[PDB]
């Protein structure tokens, strides 16, 4: 049991931590471009 | 056989599609982010 299942605890955690960063790459990449959305509208706000 | 390998394809077909599910997020982020700076190239043609 410690060879068959223990070849799988290697490969259950492997997929379940690739999928968790993909929640955090949605959030840490547009809150840098929302400041770009602030400044690009701010160029006409100068005008 | 069926006690050890019938649940492998749950972890196998998951680990053979995130190659495809995230490379489709590559080009759809490089078919859609280049158009912003190209529109910003248009502003330099006017200003």
């Amino acid at each position: 049991r410690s060879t068959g299942r223990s070849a799988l605890a290697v490969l259950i955690r492997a997929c379940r931590r690739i999928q968790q960063q993909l929640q955090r790459t949605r959030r840490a990449l547009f809150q840098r471009s929302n400041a770009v959305l602030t400044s690009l509208h701010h160029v006409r706000m100068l005008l | 056989r069926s006690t050890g390998r019938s649940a492998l394809a749950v972890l196998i077909r998951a680990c053979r599609r995130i190659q495809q599910q995230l490379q489709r997020t590559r080009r759809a982020l490089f078919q859609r982010s280049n158009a912003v700076l190209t529109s910003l190239h248009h502003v330099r043609m006017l200003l």
């Binding site: 790459t25 949605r26 509208h41 | 248009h42």
Partner: protein
């Protein structure tokens, strides 16, 4: 007469600033459509 020149240069690029703004606001639409099907696979497998 320079007021006739510079206001036309301001407002025509101001639509181009909005043609940039309607292209730059298309960018946060992207991954909010990309990983929302990839966030499906999380707790299941």
């Amino acid at each position: 007469e320079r007021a006739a020149v510079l206001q036309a240069q301001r407002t025509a690029a101001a639509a181009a600033l909005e043609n940039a703004a309607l292209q730059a606001a298309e960018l946060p639409v992207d991954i909010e459509r990309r990983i929302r099907p990839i966030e499906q696979q999380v707790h299941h497998i």
